[PDB]
C-alpha cells in the first residue's frame, strides 16, 4: 500500500566556513571553523506507512587522527576523516532531526544517531513515524600545516544513514542515504 | 581533487505494462511472465567527476524473494529469475540488468548478489571494466503472475528493488561503498478476463 521513496541526502556546505585565520600556528591537531549545520526533515519517507525508525550512520572517509571537542552548535572524542585535501580532516556530530536528541560523535566504525538510545539497547526505535530526517554537524580541522591561498575543497560523501525499522518488511529494504559534505573555496591566511 | 556526486537512481516504470487480459489458455498456469515494462538506461548512475578508474557495479535485490522462473525477455536463451515480492498478492517481478553499453549481455538477477558489468566479474574477482569517469546501467523487468491475480484497476506502489554497490581496483574509490538505489515506479495496472459472449434467440 505504501510508496517507497528514494532516500534524500543530507548536505552540509564547506562556503560556511569562516576564512581561517593562523595566529600565532604549531598546534595540531586543532579545530580551524565549524560550518553552519544543517537538517533534512525527509531522508527517508515511507508515504502512507507508519512504523518505528531508527538511522545507523557508518563514515566512510579514512579516519586520519583523534581529537576531542566540543561543538559550539561536555566534549567528546571525534575521529578525524581524510578530506583528501592536504593538512585537512573533518570531525563529524549527528543528531536526530528534533530537538531534544543530543549530538552524537562520529568516533566508531558506525553508530545509532536517533534514538541514541539504541546503541545500547538493541530493541530500541524511535515513535511510530511516516519519515526520518538528522541534523548533521561538522568541523574542520589542521592535522598539520594547512596550504594558504583559496583553496578548493571537493565534495565528499561522509557516509551514508542506514533505515532500520522493527517491522521486517521496512528493515529488510535496507534503505540507505548519503550524507554529504558540498565542496566550495575556503580562505587561508596567516 | 576529484568531487564526490549523489549517485542517480535507474528507475523502471509501471505504467508501460500493457493491459493484461487472461485468456484461457495461460489462465491457471503459475508462475507466468504477464508482461514486459518499458527497458530504461541510466549512463551516470555513478559519476567518478575528473576521476578516471576502474569500475564495476554488484546488484543486491532487496524484496522478498519467492519464487523461480525461467523466462527469455523479448527486449537469444532462456535464463533463470528470482521472482520478488511486489508485496502485491499474486503479483511479483523478475529483474534483468546490463552494462549501459551494448554488446555487454542481459544479466538475470538470481542470486543474492551478482556482477552487472563487466559479468566477468562473477567468475573472476579482479575483474573490472576499462577505466572511466563514471559507471551506468540498463534496467528490464517484467511482472509474473504467482498465482491468483487481483482483477480490476490495481495500484502497484513505487518499490525499491535493490542497490548498486561501485566497487574499483582503486583502494580511495572502492573504500567509499557508493550505492545507487534501483527503483519500479509505482502505479496502476489492468487486470481483465478476455470477453465472452452467448446466444440469444
Redesign the interface.
Known amino acids: 500500500?505504501?510508496?517507497?521513496?528514494?532516500?534524500s541526502?543530507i548536505t552540509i556546505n564547506t562556503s560556511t566556513l569562516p576564512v581561517v585565520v593562523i595566529g600565532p600556528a604549531h598546534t595540531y591537531p586543532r579545530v580551524i571553523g565549524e560550518l553552519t549545520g544543517t537538517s533534512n526533515q525527509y531522508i527517508f519517507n515511507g508515504?502512507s506507512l507508519i512504523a518505528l525508525m531508527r538511522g545507523k550512520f557508518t563514515p566512510?572517509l579514512?579516519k586520519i587522527g583523534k581529537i576531542t571537542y566540543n561543538f559550539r552548535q561536555q566534549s567528546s572524542d571525534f575521529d578525524i576523516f581524510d578530506t583528501?585535501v592536504p593538512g585537512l580532516g573533518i570531525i563529524i556530530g549527528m543528531a536526530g532531526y528534533w530537538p531534544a536528541t543530543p549530538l552524537v560523535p562520529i568516533n566508531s566504525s558506525s553508530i545509532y544517531i536517533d534514538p541514541v538510545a539504541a546503541n545500547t539497547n538493541p530493541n530500541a526505535y524511535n515513535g511510530a513515524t511516516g519519515s526520518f530526517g538528522a541534523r548533521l554537524y561538522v568541523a574542520f580541522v589542521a592535522t598539520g600545516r594547512l596550504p594558504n591561498g583559496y583553496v578548493?575543497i571537493?565534495?565528499?560523501?561522509l557516509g551514508?544513514i542506514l533505515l532500520e525499522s522493527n517491522r521486517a518488511?521496512l528493515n529488510?529494504?535496507?534503505?540507505?542515504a548519503?550524507v554529504?559534505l558540498n565542496?566550495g573555496r575556503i580562505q587561508v591566511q596567516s
Open positions: 500500500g505504501a510508496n517507497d521513496h528514494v532516500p541526502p508515504g566512510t579514512p583528501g578548493t571537493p565534495t565528499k560523501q551514508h518488511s529488510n529494504k535496507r534503505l540507505t548519503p554529504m565542496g
